[PDB]
C-alpha cells in the first residue's frame, strides 16, 4: 500500500464460487454424515480428523471417498468438476492461460485424467516429479503458448515458483491455512505480470468445504488485526465457525452461509496517566 | 566553620568545598531528632519508604498492613517543634488498597504527580497521586518482593519487578507490556535496582545467592554475575559466582552509579565495580542482616565521602563506602529496621521498623 507507487502492480479481481453437490455426491455425503462414524466422532470415542479428511475426499470427488463413461473420477460425478469443465471450456475459447491448483495430489492425478479425457495441452509439476527438473517444467510453461493448464498443489515447489505466463488461476479446493491459498493466488500475481490475473475459489457450500473456507478467513482476519489495526468489524459465530459435521445445501430459495454472514457488504506524569486510564476503561 | 566561610568568602576554596564538607559534618552528625515527630499511621511494620526526587517535599510509606501513607516532610508551622503530618493515605477503606504488606513504594521519577506500589497481593497498582486512585494494574503469578523505576531514564518507563518467580518482569507504563522476563535466576528475585548512571542497566539480587547485570535492550542475558573472589575460586558457571554467600537481600547503587552495594544474609556488605562487576575488596565488617525479604537501604549525596546507612537489627549502621569505617549506629527503634531513605537537601535521614515508627534523624548543631 505505501510501496505500491514505487511499483508498478495490476488489478486483481477474486470470485468464490458455491458449487452444489451432486445428488449422488450429496447422497454420498449425507449417508457420511448420518453414518454411526460422524456420532461417534461427536462422542469424541474416534478421532475427528479421519471424519475431515472423508468429507474433504467426498466434497472433492465421490470416486476417492467410494473408490464405458464410468471410469475412475469421471467428472460429471461432482459439482466441483462440473464447474471446472465450464471454465476451462471457456478459458480455452478465449486463448487464455490456466493454473490448476489442489490440496490433493490424488484429486491431482483425477484431474489430470479428467484433462486427459478431454484434449487440452497441460503440464503437470507435484511433489512426485524429482527437484532437479522442476525448474525446465516452470520455463516451458512460461516461455510458450502451446500448453494450456498447469497442475499445481498449493504447497509444491519453492516458495513463489515464478508461474508468469498464466492469466487465469482457479483453486479447486481451499485449505485450512490461508497463507498456503493466498500464496497460491500470489504465486500467478506476481511483479513482472503482464496480464490482469483472477482467481476462482471453488466452494461447495453448506459442506465442509465452506467451513474450511469459513476458517481461513477467520485466520486470515486474526492476522490482520494483530499485524495491522485492532478495530475491525466482527464477521463470525463461535459454534456456527465450529460445528463442521453438517449438511444444508442452498436451494436457491435462501442465499448461502458465506453471503448471509457478509450480509452487509522525559513524560509528564499525566499523558503518562491518561494513557494508563485510557487503556484501562477499555 | 568560620575557616570554611572566610575561605569561600576570599575565593581561596570553592564554594563546593563548603557544602560538600558541611554536608559530611551534618551526617556525622546525624542524630534521633526528638525535636521532629512523623505521624503515627500505619499499624504494621513500615516495610518501605520513598522520598520523592524532585523537592524533596513529600514521601511515601508502605506498611505490613498494606495502606500507603503520603507525608509532608516541610515544617509548614512557625513552630522549631513539628509533625511531619500525613497528607493523603491509601487506607483499610480506599476500595484499590492492598490486600497484603506493600513491599516498596516508588514515586515516579521527574515528576510527583504519580507514584507505584507493589505489594505481596501479587501486584504493583500505579497510584495518580492528585486523585489518589489507581490507574494501572499489573498483576503477578507471584508476590512481589521489590519493584524499582529507573531514577535517570528519559527514554523508557520500565518498572522491574522482582517476585518469588525466578524470572525478572520488566512492566512498562508507557503502554502496558509486562511479558518481557529476564531469565536467569534460579530461586525468587529479592531486589531489583536501576542503574543511576545508564538507562537501561538493572541490577538483580535473588535468592541463589547471585547479582545480575542486565542490558534490558540486550536479547542475550546478563552482561555480569558478581563473583566474591574475581576468580580465586573458578569454575564452569553453572554454581559458581555467587555474590554472597547467602540471599542477598538488598542492592543500592551508589551515587555516582559507579558501583554496587550489595548485601546478603550471610551478614556481608560488598562493593562491586559496577562496570566490571568486580569486588573492591571493601571490608564493611559484620553487617547484620537476617531479613527474609527485600531490605531497603541508601547511599548519602552530595557529600564530601559517601556513607551508606543500611539497617542493623533495631540500629541503621552508617559505614564510609569506599572506606568501609563504620562510621556509627543510629540507635533508636525498638524492631528491627527495615528501610532507611536519605533526604539529601539536609542530610536528613527517615527510617522506619517493624514497630510501627517512623524515625526521623537530623543532624545536631
Same mark, same amino acid.
Given at each position: 500500500?505505501?510501496?505500491?507507487?514505487?511499483?508498478?502492480?495490476?488489478?486483481?479481481?477474486?470470485?468464490?464460487?458455491?458449487?452444489?453437490?451432486?445428488?449422488?455426491? @450429496?447422497?454420498?455425503?449425507?449417508?457420511? /454424515?448420518?453414518? =454411526?462414524?460422524?456420532?461417534?466422532?461427536?462422542?469424541?470415542?474416534?478421532?475427528?480428523?479421519?471424519?475431515?479428511?472423508?468429507?474433504?475426499?467426498?466434497?472433492?470427488?465421490?470416486?476417492?471417498?467410494?473408490?464405458?463413461?464410468?471410469?475412475?473420477?469421471?467428472?460429471?460425478?461432482?459439482?466441483?468438476?462440473?464447474?471446472?469443465?465450464?471454465?476451462?471450456?471457456?478459458? @480455452?475459447?478465449?486463448?487464455?492461460?490456466?493454473?490448476?491448483?489442489? !490440496?490433493?495430489?490424488?484429486?491431482?492425478?483425477?484431474?489430470?485424467?479428467?484433462?486427459?479425457?478431454? =484434449?487440452?495441452?497441460?503440464?503437470?509439476?507435484?511433489?512426485?516429479? *524429482?527437484?532437479?527438473?522442476?525448474?525446465?517444467?516452470? *520455463?516451458?510453461?512460461?516461455?510458450?503458448?502451446?500448453?494450456?493448464?498447469?497442475?499445481?498443489?498449493?504447497?509444491?515447489?519453492?516458495?513463489?515458483?515464478?508461474?508468469?505466463?498464466?492469466?487465469? /488461476?482457479?483453486?479447486?479446493?481451499?485449505?485450512?491455512?490461508?497463507?498456503?491459498?493466498?500464496?497460491?493466488?500470489?504465486?500467478?500475481?506476481?511483479?513482472?505480470?503482464?496480464?490482469? /490475473?483472477?482467481?476462482?475459489?471453488?466452494?461447495?457450500?453448506?459442506?465442509?468445504?465452506?467451513?474450511?473456507?469459513?476458517?481461513?478467513?477467520? =485466520?486470515?482476519?486474526?492476522?490482520?488485526?494483530?499485524?495491522?489495526?485492532?478495530?475491525?468489524?466482527?464477521?463470525?459465530?463461535?459454534?456456527?465457525?465450529?460445528?463442521?459435521?453438517?449438511?444444508?445445501?442452498?436451494?436457491?430459495? !435462501?442465499?448461502?452461509?458465506?453471503?448471509?454472514?457478509?450480509?452487509?457488504?522525559?513524560?509528564?506524569?499525566?499523558?503518562?496517566?491518561?494513557?494508563?486510564?485510557?487503556?484501562? @476503561?477499555? | 566553620?568560620?575557616?570554611? +566561610?572566610?575561605?569561600?568568602?576570599?575565593?581561596?576554596?570553592?564554594?563546593?568545598?563548603?557544602?560538600?564538607? &558541611?554536608?559530611?559534618?551534618?551526617?556525622?552528625?546525624?542524630?534521633?531528632?526528638?525535636?521532629?515527630?512523623?505521624?503515627?499511621?500505619?499499624?504494621?511494620?513500615?516495610?518501605?519508604?520513598?522520598?520523592?526526587?524532585?523537592?524533596?517535599?513529600?514521601?511515601?510509606?508502605?506498611?505490613?498492613?498494606?495502606?500507603?501513607?503520603?507525608?509532608?516532610?516541610?515544617?509548614?508551622?512557625?513552630?522549631?517543634?513539628?509533625?511531619?503530618?500525613?497528607?493523603?493515605?491509601?487506607?483499610?477503606?480506599?476500595?484499590?488498597?492492598?490486600?497484603?504488606?506493600?513491599?516498596?513504594?516508588?514515586?515516579?521519577?521527574?515528576?510527583?504527580?504519580?507514584?507505584?506500589?507493589?505489594?505481596?497481593?501479587?501486584?504493583?497498582?500505579?497510584?495518580?497521586?492528585?486523585?489518589?486512585?489507581?490507574?494501572?494494574?499489573?498483576?503477578?503469578? &507471584?508476590?512481589?518482593?521489590?519493584?524499582?523505576?529507573?531514577?535517570? #531514564? $528519559?527514554?523508557?518507563?520500565?518498572?522491574?519487578?522482582?517476585?518469588?518467580?525466578?524470572?525478572?518482569?520488566?512492566?512498562?507504563?508507557?503502554?502496558?507490556?509486562?511479558?518481557?522476563?529476564?531469565?536467569?535466576?534460579?530461586?525468587?528475585?529479592?531486589?531489583?535496582?536501576? #542503574?543511576?548512571?545508564?538507562?537501561?542497566?538493572?541490577?538483580?539480587?535473588?535468592?541463589?545467592?547471585?547479582?545480575?547485570?542486565?542490558?534490558?535492550?540486550?536479547?542475550?542475558?546478563?552482561?555480569?554475575?558478581?563473583?566474591?573472589?574475581?576468580?580465586?575460586?573458578?569454575?564452569?558457571?553453572?554454581?559458581?559466582?555467587?555474590?554472597?554467600?547467602?540471599?542477598?537481600?538488598?542492592?543500592?547503587?551508589?551515587?555516582?552509579?559507579?558501583?554496587?552495594? $550489595?548485601?546478603?544474609?550471610?551478614?556481608?556488605?560488598?562493593?562491586?565495580? #559496577?562496570?566490571?562487576?568486580?569486588?573492591?575488596?571493601?571490608?564493611?565488617?559484620?553487617?547484620?542482616?537476617?531479613?527474609?525479604?527485600?531490605?531497603?537501604?541508601?547511599?548519602?549525596?552530595?557529600?564530601?565521602?559517601?556513607?551508606?546507612?543500611?539497617?542493623?537489627?533495631?540500629?541503621?549502621?552508617?559505614? $564510609?563506602?569506599?572506606?568501609?569505617?563504620?562510621?556509627?549506629?543510629?540507635?533508636?527503634?525498638?524492631?528491627?529496621?527495615?528501610?532507611?531513605?536519605?533526604?539529601?537537601?539536609?542530610?536528613?535521614?527517615?527510617?522506619?521498623?517493624?514497630?510501627?515508627?517512623?524515625?526521623?534523624?537530623?543532624?545536631? +548543631?
Amino acid at each position: 500500500s505505501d510501496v505500491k507507487m514505487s511499483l508498478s502492480l495490476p488489478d486483481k479481481n477474486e470470485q468464490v464460487l458455491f458449487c452444489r453437490l451432486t445428488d449422488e455426491q @450429496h447422497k454420498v455425503y449425507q449417508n457420511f /454424515v448420518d453414518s =454411526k462414524e460422524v456420532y461417534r466422532i461427536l462422542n469424541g470415542e474416534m478421532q475427528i480428523f479421519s471424519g475431515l479428511i472423508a468429507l474433504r475426499k467426498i466434497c472433492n470427488h465421490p470416486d476417492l471417498f467410494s473408490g464405458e463413461e464410468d471410469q475412475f473420477g469421471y467428472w460429471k460425478r461432482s459439482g466441483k468438476m462440473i464447474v471446472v469443465e465450464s471454465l476451462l471450456k471457456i478459458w @480455452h475459447k478465449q486463448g487464455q492461460r490456466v493454473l490448476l491448483f489442489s !490440496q490433493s495430489r490424488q484429486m491431482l492425478d483425477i484431474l489430470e485424467v479428467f484433462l486427459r479425457a478431454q =484434449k487440452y495441452t497441460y503440464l503437470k509439476m507435484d511433489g512426485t516429479t *524429482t527437484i532437479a527438473s522442476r525448474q525446465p517444467l516452470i *520455463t516451458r510453461y512460461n516461455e510458450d503458448t502451446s500448453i494450456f493448464v498447469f497442475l499445481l498443489t498449493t504447497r509444491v515447489g519453492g516458495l513463489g515458483v515464478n508461474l508468469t505466463g498464466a492469466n487465469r /488461476v482457479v483453486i479447486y479446493d481451499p485449505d485450512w491455512n490461508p497463507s498456503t491459498d493466498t500464496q497460491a493466488r500470489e504465486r500467478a500475481w506476481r511483479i513482472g505480470q503482464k496480464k490482469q /490475473v483472477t482467481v476462482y475459489r471453488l466452494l461447495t457450500a453448506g459442506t465442509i468445504e465452506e467451513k474450511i473456507y469459513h476458517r481461513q478467513i477467520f =485466520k486470515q482476519f486474526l492476522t490482520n488485526r494483530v499485524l495491522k489495526d485492532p478495530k475491525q468489524r466482527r464477521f463470525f459465530k463461535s459454534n456456527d465457525l465450529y460445528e463442521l459435521f453438517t449438511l444444508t445445501s442452498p436451494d436457491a430459495s !435462501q442465499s448461502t452461509e458465506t453471503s448471509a454472514i457478509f450480509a452487509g457488504t522525559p513524560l509528564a506524569s499525566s499523558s503518562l496517566l491518561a494513557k494508563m486510564r485510557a487503556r484501562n @476503561h477499555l | 566553620m568560620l575557616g570554611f +566561610l572566610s575561605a569561600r568568602q576570599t575565593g581561596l576554596e570553592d564554594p563546593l568545598r563548603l557544602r560538600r564538607a &558541611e554536608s559530611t559534618r551534618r551526617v556525622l552528625g546525624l542524630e534521633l531528632n526528638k525535636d521532629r515527630d512523623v505521624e503515627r499511621i500505619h499499624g504494621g511494620g513500615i516495610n518501605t519508604l520513598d522520598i520523592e526526587p524532585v523537592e524533596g517535599r513529600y514521601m511515601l510509606s508502605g506498611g505490613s498492613d498494606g495502606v500507603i501513607v503520603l507525608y509532608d516532610l516541610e515544617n509548614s508551622s512557625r513552630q522549631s517543634y513539628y509533625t511531619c503530618k500525613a497528607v493523603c493515605s491509601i487506607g483499610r477503606d480506599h476500595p484499590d488498597v492492598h490486600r497484603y504488606s506493600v513491599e516498596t513504594v516508588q514515586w515516579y521519577p521527574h515528576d510527583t504527580g504519580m507514584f507505584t506500589s507493589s505489594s505481596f497481593d501479587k501486584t504493583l497498582k500505579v497510584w495518580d497521586t492528585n486523585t489518589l486512585q489507581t490507574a494501572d494494574v499489573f498483576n503477578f503469578e &507471584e508476590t512481589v518482593y521489590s519493584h524499582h523505576m529507573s531514577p535517570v #531514564s $528519559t527514554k523508557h518507563c520500565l518498572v522491574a519487578v522482582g517476585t518469588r518467580g525466578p524470572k525478572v518482569q520488566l512492566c512498562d507504563l508507557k503502554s502496558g507490556s509486562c511479558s518481557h522476563i529476564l531469565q536467569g535466576h534460579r530461586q525468587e528475585i529479592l531486589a531489583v535496582s536501576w #542503574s543511576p548512571r545508564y538507562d537501561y542497566i538493572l541490577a538483580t539480587a535473588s535468592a541463589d545467592s547471585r547479582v545480575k547485570l542486565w542490558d534490558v535492550r540486550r536479547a542475550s542475558g546478563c552482561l555480569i554475575t558478581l563473583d566474591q573472589h574475581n576468580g580465586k575460586k573458578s569454575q564452569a558457571v553453572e554454581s559458581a559466582n555467587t555474590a554472597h554467600n547467602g540471599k542477598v537481600n538488598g542492592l543500592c547503587f551508589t551515587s555516582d552509579g559507579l558501583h554496587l552495594l $550489595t548485601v546478603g544474609t550471610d551478614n556481608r556488605m560488598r562493593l562491586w565495580n #559496577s562496570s566490571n562487576g568486580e569486588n573492591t575488596l571493601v571490608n564493611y565488617g559484620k553487617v547484620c542482616n537476617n531479613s527474609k525479604k527485600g531490605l531497603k537501604f541508601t547511599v548519602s549525596c552530595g557529600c564530601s565521602s559517601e556513607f551508606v546507612f543500611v539497617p542493623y537489627g533495631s540500629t541503621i549502621a552508617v559505614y $564510609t563506602v569506599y572506606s568501609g569505617e563504620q562510621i556509627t549506629m543510629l540507635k533508636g527503634h525498638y524492631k528491627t529496621v527495615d528501610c532507611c531513605v536519605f533526604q539529601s537537601n539536609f542530610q536528613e535521614l527517615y527510617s522506619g521498623s517493624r514497630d510501627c515508627n517512623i524515625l526521623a534523624w537530623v543532624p545536631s +548543631l
